[PDB]
Structures are given as C-alpha cells and as structure tokens.
Design a protein around this ligand. Structure first.
Ligand SMILES: [Ca+2]
Length: 554
C-alpha cells in the first residue's frame, strides 16, 4: 500500500496561516517557522493552496505566471527553503495545480486577446455572440454570464469562474504541451503531490449548445460532462506523472458520484485520490447560498455511497473542511460555547477513522468556528459579490436576506486568520490582517490548546498517534452498522483479522448504543466526553451528549 494511503495531510491556506513581515498576509517564512508545530501534531504531508504569481482577484487561483512564486508569499529561494525544511523533518509537500483557467494577466492571454490571427488565439475559447447577446446561456460561478465580450475582436471569451479567470483550451495540442512542461518544472524540484483544482471541467462541450432549464439550475454538473475529459487526464498521466513519484488528487467538483471511479480507478492511469463534494455540500441548496436541514441519517448514507465508489482499485480523501467551505464544527457539529469542544472532538474522531486519506483543514484542530459577519462589507469573498450581482441587484433577494444566509455558507468563514495565541490579532500578524480575526481567539488559540491535555488539539494529536499505530484505521474495510439511525453514528474498520468499532453520538443528549449480536468490546482505545470506558465484554454502551469512542472488539 502506498505511503499516501496511510498518511495524514494538513491543508495550509498560506494567506491566512502566519505573517512574518507586518503586511497582514501570511507567507512562506511564516509557514516554515511553524513546521515544528505541524510535525508535533503528527502531520505527514501538507497541501498548500496556490503559491504562484497572481493579481489575487481570487487569492492565488488566478495565476499570471506558473513558474514564479506569489510576491506576497516570498521568493523562489523562500519556496526552496520551505521544501528543504519539510524534507529535514521527513514531511512531504502537495501543491495546488490550477489549469482549468489562468489569470487574464497571463502573457498567453494578453497575446490571445490582441487579435484573431495570433499563435495564442486558441489557448482560450473565443466565440461570436448569438442573436445580439452572449454565445449561449452559460452562467459563471462568480456572477453574470460565463462569456465576456472583448471589443478588440468583438468575440466573447469563456470564464466558468471570475471574469479575470479565462478558461484554458485543452482542445489545443500546443496548450496541453505547455501545461505538461509547466508541471515538470515543479515536479523536477521534488514536490511529492499535486492537487488539481476543478479537475472535472477541463473538457468543454463541442459547439457550446445552450443548457436546458434543468441544467441551468445545476450548471456545475453540466460543466463536468465534456467528451474529452478522460482522454486529457490519461494523456497527462502518460506524459507527466508516469515519469515521477508524486501522488495526484483531483477536486472533482460538480460531477455525479457514479462517474468518480473513472478518475481514480488505479487501472485507468488517471488520478490517485478523489476529493468529492457530496458530503460537504449535502445540506447546500442548488443556488449554493441557502442551506437545507439534514440529519445524521443523510450524513452517514452519503459517506456509505462515496466509500462504495472507491471499490477495490480507487481511493478517497476524507475531509470536513477546506478553503471553499464553512467551518467543520459550525457546519457539522454545534459551535455554541457549551458544545463546541465536545462536538469538535467527535468530528475529529470521525475524520481520523474514515477509509481514505484524511485532510485536516488549518484551525480545525483548535475547534475554530464560523465568523460573526455583521455586514456584507465584512466579506472579501468574490463569490459573495457574485451572489450580490445575481440576486440583490436583480431584485430576487434583499441585502439582508443575502447576509443572513451567506453568513452560514461563505468560504470566508474558513479564511479568517489562524489563531496562534491571545496577543494582538491572535499572533497571526504585527500589522493589520487582510481579513478580520475572529474575536473568540481569546478562548480559541494554539498556545492555550497545546498546554492543555484535555483540549481539542490534544485529542487530535492523540487520535493521529492511534491511527498511525493501527493499520485497520486507514486501509481497513468500512461497514456502517445501521445507515437508518439518525442519532448515533457507528461503524467498524477491519484488517487482517482485527476489528475496531467507532461510536459517535451526534445528539446533545444521552443515548444508548447496542452492539451487533455477537460483537463485544475487547478494549477501549480512546473516548471524548466520557466519564468511564466500557467494561471488557460489554454488549452495549451508554453515551454522553456528543461522546465519541474507538474500541477494539471481539
Ligand atoms: Ca506577509
């Protein structure tokens, strides 16, 4: 089994991790200075968000030169030093790869847009408008049409994401070759992994027909149905990843779950691991800014479906948080002051006992929460400006309705600065932070958590040790004990004759749990929020509100 199947990854959003020069923005020196912190937590590998030259209309996801580092993060020597310090500690780097689209400030795009006849014209998608308007009805994730007119040629260019993020044209062989050369530039430096942003949208539909009214309400899914998608992923593997030893993982956003095996079945020679969004978006409405109430039965049934698509030859990541989603404890747990620590531990237990490679998002090991936004001016999020354009300016919603609802879903909840201690701005910066620090940093910070054996951080650290010592808990089979139960989540992990039971109360009330007939507790590995372990031989358990536990059975 490869190293990445048993590894524990941590995701660093460098903009918000640690600033070392007072400009309010996190940087490479900051990340490098905190490597001992991450080593001591027990992290094997870090995934960093984009670190390349960028105008930052979308905080690194609009890249203007793929072979230079972002000015705010440091220099190429700072990147090289990050790499060297990771290696000293036996840790690996995964970088973010953003090749569905570039910045409109990339030299390819400046050349492409200049005339119709130039060698870069087909690096992007340029099309004539139809019947007085855009080439078709495609919407953009970030507001308005996915087509933007350029008066120089009178044609429109495609952008699924922001106006400043034109889509790259994978149908053009010279363009594919340029992307492959660029990937080699980074892999030659020794990076150990690559995470592919919106990997399912690379192939565009020939002819760009209109979306149907059905497709229009779920456009994210129509954009994943390009006919050449797997041909491109296979060619990238053959020309690039076959020559290296790096792991690959795809952000498969918008794809129907039954198509996921095409990306990750190891026999297909495409990607190694999947990030899927069925679970993290399980309670999101189609418009992406409302929430729909769900129960633990929905949570566990979604997991069971995602596990089944990995089958025998594929592999899943597991995550409860990332830079595009609200905080795990607020979203899946209960972030009220009395339940925040109990429920954040319960979610740690879930995260670290799933079948797949877990990714811990920066700050979740502290039990960091959603941010108390007060006005729409408190959001940096360009996705929020897009909802304002699509919903407030059009009269569909008031500003107060947008505010109330996006406060719960906005990705800026995940982007507030990491809370290091209780000094000014939580020790993130000596200057003014680019996004405000959550005021609860006085109660939620790394310095106070590390020093307390009973903290959320200590629980994460202890779980990571246990997982490392117990192979069933990464590579073992997974079986949900009762998918209909909406109160208590329970499942087994087994490998090579060893079976482990995981039991997690999702109610803020006491609950009982009866083990399957014949199964008995043999040993308790760890519990959260419990006054007493069960007795060896127990056929049932009494659970405190939000209690979690791992037990060896038989
Ligand atoms: Ca800085």
């Amino acid at each position: 089994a490869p190293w990445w199947k048993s590894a524990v990854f941590y995701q660093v959003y460098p903009r918000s991790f640690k600033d070392t020069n007072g400009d309010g923005i996190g940087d490479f020196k900051g990340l490098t200075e905190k490597l001992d912190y991450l080593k001591g937590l027990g992290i094997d590998a870090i995934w960093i968000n984009p670190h390349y030259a960028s105008p930052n209309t979308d905080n690194g996801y609009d890249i203007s030169d793929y072979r230079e580092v972002m000015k705010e993060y440091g220099t190429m020597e700072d990147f090289d030093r990050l790499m060297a310090e990771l290696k000293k500690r036996g840790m690996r780097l995964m970088v973010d790869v953003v090749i569905n689209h570039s910045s409109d400030q990339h030299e390819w795009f400046k050349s492409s847009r200049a005339s119709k006849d130039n060698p870069y014209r087909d690096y992007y998608f340029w099309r004539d408008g139809k019947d007085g308007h855009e080439p078709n009805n495609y919407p953009s994730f970030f507001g308005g049409s996915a087509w933007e007119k350029d008066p120089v040629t009178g044609q429109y260019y495609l952008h699924y994401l922001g106006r400043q993020q034109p889509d790259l044209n994978w149908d053009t062989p010279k363009l594919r070759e340029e992307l492959y050369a660029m990937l080699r530039f980074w892999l030659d430096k020794g990076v150990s992994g690559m995470r592919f942003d919106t990997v399912a949208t690379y192939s565009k539909t020939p002819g760009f027909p209109d979306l149907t009214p059905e497709q229009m309400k779920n456009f994210a899914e129509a954009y994943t149905q390009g006919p050449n998608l797997h041909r491109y992923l296979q060619e990238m593997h053959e020309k690039v990843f076959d020559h290296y030893d790096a792991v690959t993982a795809g952000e498969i956003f918008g794809a129907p779950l039954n198509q996921v095996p095409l990306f990750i079945d190891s026999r297909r020679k495409e990607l190694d691991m999947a990030f899927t969004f069925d679970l993290i978006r399980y309670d999101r409405a189609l418009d992406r800014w409302h929430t729909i109430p769900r129960t633990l039965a929905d949570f566990r049934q979604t997991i069971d479906k995602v596990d089944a698509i990995a089958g025998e030859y594929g592999w899943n990541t597991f995550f409860l948080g990332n830079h595009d989603n609200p905080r795990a404890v607020s979203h899946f747990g209960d972030d009220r002051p009395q339940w925040r620590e109990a429920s954040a531990k319960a979610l740690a237990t879930v995260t670290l006992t799933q079948r797949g490679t877990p990714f811990i998002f920066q700050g979740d090991e502290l039990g960091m929460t959603n941010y108390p936004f007060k006005t729409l001016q408190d959001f940096d999020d360009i996705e929020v400006k897009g909802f304002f354009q699509d919903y407030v300016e059009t009269g569909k919603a008031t500003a107060e309705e947008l505010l109330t609802n996006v406060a719960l879903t906005s990705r800026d909840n995940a982007r507030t600065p990491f809370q290091w201690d209780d000094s000014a701005n939580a020790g993130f910066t000596t200057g003014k932070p680019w996004l405000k620090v959550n005021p609860n940093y006085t109660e939620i910070n790394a310095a106070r958590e590390i020093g307390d054996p009973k903290s959320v951080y200590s629980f994460y650290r202890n779980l990571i040790s246990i997982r490392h010592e117990t192979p069933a808990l990464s590579t073992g089979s997974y079986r949900d004990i009762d998918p209909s139960n909406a109160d208590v989540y329970a499942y087994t992990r087994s490998q090579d004759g060893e079976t482990y039971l995981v039991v997690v109360n999702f109610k803020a009330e006491p609950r009982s749990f009866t083990l399957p007939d014949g199964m008995h507790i043999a040993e308790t590995l760890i519990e959260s929020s419990s006054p007493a372990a069960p007795a060896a031989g127990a056929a049932s358990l009494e659970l405190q509100p939000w209690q979690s536990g791992i037990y060896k059975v038989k």
